[PDB]
Design an enzyme around this catalytic site. Structure first.
Site, short mmCIF file in Angstrom:
data_model
loop_
_atom_site.label_atom_id
_atom_site.label_comp_id
_atom_site.label_asym_id
_atom_site.label_seq_id
_atom_site.Cartn_x
_atom_site.Cartn_y
_atom_site.Cartn_z
N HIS A 2 0.81 -1.26 0.00
CA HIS A 2 0.00 0.00 0.00
C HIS A 2 0.85 1.32 0.00
CE1 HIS A 2 -3.75 -2.26 0.75
NE2 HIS A 2 -3.14 -2.90 1.73
N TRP A 5 -1.51 4.12 1.83
CA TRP A 5 -1.92 3.81 3.21
C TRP A 5 -0.79 3.49 4.17
CZ3 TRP A 5 -5.91 5.90 5.44
CH2 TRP A 5 -7.10 6.15 4.69
N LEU A 159 -16.61 9.51 -1.00
CA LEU A 159 -15.43 9.50 -1.83
C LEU A 159 -15.72 8.98 -3.25
CD1 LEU A 159 -12.40 9.83 -2.48
CD2 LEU A 159 -12.08 7.64 -1.33
N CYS A 160 -15.41 9.75 -4.30
CA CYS A 160 -15.84 9.36 -5.70
C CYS A 160 -14.83 9.95 -6.69
CB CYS A 160 -17.22 9.90 -6.03
SG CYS A 160 -17.81 9.13 -7.56
N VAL A 161 -14.23 9.10 -7.52
CA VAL A 161 -13.41 9.58 -8.65
C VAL A 161 -14.12 9.20 -9.92
CG1 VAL A 161 -11.22 9.26 -9.90
CG2 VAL A 161 -11.19 9.68 -7.38
N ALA A 171 -7.38 9.54 -5.68
CA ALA A 171 -8.06 9.35 -4.36
C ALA A 171 -7.10 9.75 -3.21
CB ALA A 171 -8.62 7.91 -4.20
N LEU A 411 -24.64 6.93 6.38
CA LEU A 411 -25.66 7.12 5.34
C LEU A 411 -25.09 6.80 3.93
CD1 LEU A 411 -27.01 10.56 6.46
CD2 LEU A 411 -28.15 8.28 6.90
C1 LIG Z 1 -8.38 13.94 10.48
C2 LIG Z 1 -9.21 14.03 9.18
C3 LIG Z 1 -8.83 12.90 8.17
C4 LIG Z 1 -9.92 12.75 7.06
C5 LIG Z 1 -9.56 11.58 6.05
C6 LIG Z 1 -9.71 10.20 6.69
C7 LIG Z 1 -9.56 9.05 5.68
C8 LIG Z 1 -10.81 8.95 4.71
C9 LIG Z 1 -10.49 7.74 3.78
C10 LIG Z 1 -11.53 7.62 2.67
C11 LIG Z 1 -12.76 6.88 3.21
C12 LIG Z 1 -13.85 6.82 2.09
C13 LIG Z 1 -15.13 6.05 2.50
C14 LIG Z 1 -15.96 5.88 1.28
O1 LIG Z 1 -16.54 6.85 0.76
S1 LIG Z 1 -16.16 4.25 0.70
C15 LIG Z 1 -16.93 4.61 -0.95
C16 LIG Z 1 -15.77 4.75 -1.90
N1 LIG Z 1 -16.32 5.08 -3.22
C17 LIG Z 1 -16.61 4.16 -4.18
O2 LIG Z 1 -16.38 2.94 -4.03
C18 LIG Z 1 -17.14 4.76 -5.49
C19 LIG Z 1 -16.56 4.09 -6.77
N2 LIG Z 1 -15.10 4.01 -6.78
C20 LIG Z 1 -14.35 5.12 -6.91
O3 LIG Z 1 -14.90 6.20 -7.07
C21 LIG Z 1 -12.89 5.01 -6.91
O4 LIG Z 1 -12.46 3.68 -7.21
C22 LIG Z 1 -12.28 5.37 -5.54
C23 LIG Z 1 -12.56 6.83 -5.20
C24 LIG Z 1 -12.82 4.60 -4.35
C25 LIG Z 1 -10.81 5.04 -5.60
O5 LIG Z 1 -10.09 5.69 -6.65
P1 LIG Z 1 -9.24 4.88 -7.79
O6 LIG Z 1 -9.77 3.48 -7.94
O7 LIG Z 1 -9.16 5.78 -8.97
O8 LIG Z 1 -7.83 4.63 -7.09
P2 LIG Z 1 -6.56 5.69 -6.98
O9 LIG Z 1 -5.49 5.23 -7.94
O10 LIG Z 1 -7.02 7.05 -7.10
O11 LIG Z 1 -6.12 5.39 -5.46
C26 LIG Z 1 -5.63 4.18 -4.97
C27 LIG Z 1 -5.54 4.16 -3.45
O12 LIG Z 1 -6.86 4.33 -2.88
C28 LIG Z 1 -7.08 3.32 -1.97
N3 LIG Z 1 -8.52 3.09 -1.94
C29 LIG Z 1 -9.36 2.41 -2.84
N4 LIG Z 1 -10.65 2.46 -2.42
C30 LIG Z 1 -10.63 3.17 -1.23
C31 LIG Z 1 -11.64 3.53 -0.30
N5 LIG Z 1 -12.98 3.20 -0.49
N6 LIG Z 1 -11.28 4.27 0.80
C32 LIG Z 1 -9.97 4.58 1.01
N7 LIG Z 1 -8.96 4.26 0.15
C33 LIG Z 1 -9.29 3.53 -0.95
C34 LIG Z 1 -6.25 2.13 -2.52
O13 LIG Z 1 -6.18 1.15 -1.52
C35 LIG Z 1 -5.01 2.87 -2.99
O14 LIG Z 1 -4.06 3.11 -1.96
P3 LIG Z 1 -2.79 2.17 -1.67
O15 LIG Z 1 -3.42 0.88 -1.30
O16 LIG Z 1 -2.00 2.36 -2.93
O17 LIG Z 1 -2.12 2.62 -0.35
O1 LIG Z 2 -20.88 2.47 4.79
C1 LIG Z 2 -21.60 3.19 4.08
C2 LIG Z 2 -21.11 4.60 3.68
C3 LIG Z 2 -19.73 4.52 2.99
O2 LIG Z 2 -19.02 5.76 3.00
C4 LIG Z 2 -19.85 4.28 1.46
C5 LIG Z 2 -20.45 2.97 1.05
C6 LIG Z 2 -21.59 3.00 0.23
C7 LIG Z 2 -22.16 1.76 -0.13
C8 LIG Z 2 -21.56 0.57 0.30
CL1 LIG Z 2 -22.32 -0.98 -0.19
C9 LIG Z 2 -20.43 0.53 1.12
C10 LIG Z 2 -19.85 1.78 1.46
N1 LIG Z 2 -22.82 2.76 3.68
C11 LIG Z 2 -23.82 3.56 2.94
C12 LIG Z 2 -24.84 2.50 2.52
C13 LIG Z 2 -26.22 3.14 2.30
O3 LIG Z 2 -26.68 3.86 3.44
C14 LIG Z 2 -24.88 1.55 3.71
C15 LIG Z 2 -25.49 0.20 3.35
C16 LIG Z 2 -26.42 -0.35 4.27
C17 LIG Z 2 -27.04 -1.60 4.07
C18 LIG Z 2 -26.67 -2.19 2.91
CL2 LIG Z 2 -27.50 -3.79 2.69
C19 LIG Z 2 -25.72 -1.72 1.97
C20 LIG Z 2 -25.10 -0.47 2.20
C21 LIG Z 2 -23.37 1.39 4.00
MG LIG Z 3 -7.29 8.00 -9.71
#
Ligand SMILES: CCCCCCCCCCCCCC(=O)SCCNC(=O)CCNC(=O)[C@H](O)C(C)(C)COP(=O)(O)OP(=O)(O)OC[C@H]1O[C@@H](n2cnc3c(N)ncnc32)[C@H](O)[C@@H]1OP(=O)(O)O
Ligand SMILES: O=C(C[C@H](O)Cc1ccc(Cl)cc1)N1C[C@H](CO)[C@@H](c2ccc(Cl)cc2)C1
Ligand SMILES: [Mg+2]
Length: 411
Positions: A2, A5, A159-161, A171, A411
């Site tokens: 990673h 990460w 989070l969405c790209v 991301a 949510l």
């Molecule tokens: C103190 C305040 C701090 C606040 C921040 C706290 C942290 C918040 C963290 C975010 C919490 C979000 C919670 C949610 O919303 S989970 C919902 C995430 N969204 C989706 O699944 C939507 C569809 N997919 C996408 O839009 C893209 O594939 C995403 C955006 C997910 C990745 O973009 P892409 O596919 O173009 O990849 P890259 O080349 O840019 O990047 C690659 C790196 O990203 C790591 N990766 C992949 N998926 C995730 C994931 N879900 N959380 C964290 N990291 C993830 C991966 O392991 C790799 O790192 P490394 O393994 O090389 O190390």
């Molecule tokens: O963890 C999250 C928020 C997280 O950043 C993004 C995310 C979205 C969908 C999914 Cl699959 C996993 C993660 N969730 C949002 C989903 C809808 O409220 C919630 C869910 C509940 C029950 C079922 Cl059966 C499936 C999904 C989980």
């Molecule tokens: Mg990317």
């Protein structure tokens, strides 16, 4: 394994997580003053953007980025379709911080290419109960309780790209810039969930579904007719019968929640959520925001007899796009939200949830096995779905816990 990460303040492996006995920060204490004033460097074709959520066009641009590019199931059949009304509700709770909503646009056209959102949450996140017992046996109670008080931290979501921008390490840049903006407000922890495995979860739980409109679910291939139903002359008719529900609720004082209920709902909810190791603390304004009914978004009912609110439940709506089927464009899903029962068994309260959701035209009721969601899975005919939801902290060491010790709905 990673590249991003491995540079971040999170536990790196399961056996590292295994050596954690007290809640507390991963990193060095830091100050606002230490954090760079300027946005993280970005490539000259892109620009940072802070949408204005109390403006219609900005909400619409993030709505379309998510509609087309957000979470799908694993064979590309369904994609979440959060509404614009839903997004304003989820992104703008009381005292939200507008600059924690972080976007990337293309300079040439202002096309939204990436998004991440943070919102305030007040979270109990002190050492879990089972580790406090192990602490007293060792003589270590004081270290165990140091972070017991609720903390004002960030909850990350959305989070969405864009699909055309995938796998270009965008991301990480989003997450770095979110972390900088959150740190510039003197907040050092975040909580997030994902349906993927990352380093390294503090809890994991299965998804569960309860069919409400079984003929539509099978048509869109959300559901199959299970094997067992073939022994029957009419497999589908028997499937409909298995999932039928009353037309009207069974609990007599059931009604929609109103503004005057806020204090009593706050009371009974907070008393309930206390029983869990990781759980939100809600003010009256936050109870109002997240629970008062909103058309097409959140639905909340109280049981009142004798002018006391003694029980309530809530659910929220998110439709998913059915990635083309002839007959149907949308799966209309209801998701179990907060609840509390003090006068009737939890299964009898949630049956009324299913009955309301069904009468209002929902196709399926969904939930994760958090809270006490297990006590009603069998009698209410929920089934386990595919995969698991994982819960994470950012900059917070934490002992592994069971999902039934988690009370934060994401949510
Ligand atoms: C103190 C305040 C701090 C606040 C921040 C706290 C942290 C918040 C963290 C975010 C919490 C979000 C919670 C949610 O919303 S989970 C919902 C995430 N969204 C989706 O699944 C939507 C569809 N997919 C996408 O839009 C893209 O594939 C995403 C955006 C997910 C990745 O973009 P892409 O596919 O173009 O990849 P890259 O080349 O840019 O990047 C690659 C790196 O990203 C790591 N990766 C992949 N998926 C995730 C994931 N879900 N959380 C964290 N990291 C993830 C991966 O392991 C790799 O790192 P490394 O393994 O090389 O190390
Ligand atoms: O963890 C999250 C928020 C997280 O950043 C993004 C995310 C979205 C969908 C999914 Cl699959 C996993 C993660 N969730 C949002 C989903 C809808 O409220 C919630 C869910 C509940 C029950 C079922 Cl059966 C499936 C999904 C989980
Ligand atoms: Mg990317």
């Amino acid at each position: 394994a990673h590249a991003f990460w491995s540079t971040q303040p999170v536990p790196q492996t399961e056996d590292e997580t295994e050596k954690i006995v007290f809640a507390g920060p991963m990193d060095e204490p830091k100050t606002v003053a230490d954090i760079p004033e300027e946005p993280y460097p970005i490539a000259s074709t892109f620009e940072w953007w802070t949408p204005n959520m109390e403006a219609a066009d900005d909400i619409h641009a993030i709505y379309e980025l998510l509609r087309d590019n957000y979470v799908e199931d694993d064979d590309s059949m369904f994609r979440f379709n959060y509404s614009e009304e839903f997004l304003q509700w989820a992104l703008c709770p009381p005292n939200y911080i507008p600059d924690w909503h972080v976007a990337v646009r293309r300079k040439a056209d202002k096309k939204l290419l990436a998004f991440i959102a943070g919102v305030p949450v007040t979270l109990r996140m002190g050492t879990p109960k089972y580790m406090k017992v192990k602490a007293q046996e060792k003589g270590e109670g004081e270290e165990a309780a140091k972070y017991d008080e609720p903390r004002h931290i960030c909850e990350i979501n959305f989070l969405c790209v864009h699909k055309q921008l995938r796998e270009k390490r965008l991301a990480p840049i989003l997450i770095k810039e979110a972390t900088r903006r959150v740190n510039r407000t003197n907040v050092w922890q975040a909580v997030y969930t994902a349906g993927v495995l990352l380093p390294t979860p503090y809890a994991s739980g299965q998804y569960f579904h309860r069919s409400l409109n079984p003929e539509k679910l099978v048509e869109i291939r959300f559901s199959g007719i299970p094997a067992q139903y073939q022994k029957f002359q009419n497999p589908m008719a028997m499937l409909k019968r298995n999932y039928q529900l009353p037309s009207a609720p069974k609990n007599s004082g059931l009604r929609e929640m109103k503004p005057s209920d806020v204090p009593q709902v706050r009371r009974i909810l907070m008393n309930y959520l206390d029983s869990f190791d990781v759980g939100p603390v809600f003010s009256d304004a936050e109870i109002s925001h997240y629970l008062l009914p909103r058309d097409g978004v959140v639905f909340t009912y109280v049981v009142e007899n004798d002018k006391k609110v003694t029980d309530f439940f809530s659910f929220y709506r998110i439709p998913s796009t059915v990635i083309g089927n002839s007959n149907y464009n949308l799966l209309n899903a209801a998701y179990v939200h907060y609840y509390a029962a003090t006068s009737i068994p939890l299964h009898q309260l949630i049956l009324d949830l299913l009955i309301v959701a069904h009468s209002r035209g929902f196709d399926v009721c969904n939930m994760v096995e958090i809270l006490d969601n297990r006590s009603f899975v069998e009698q209410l005919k929920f089934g386990a779905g595919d995969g698991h939801l994982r819960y994470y902290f950012y900059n917070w060491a934490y002992p592994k816990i069971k999902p039934s010790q988690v009370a934060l709905v994401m949510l």
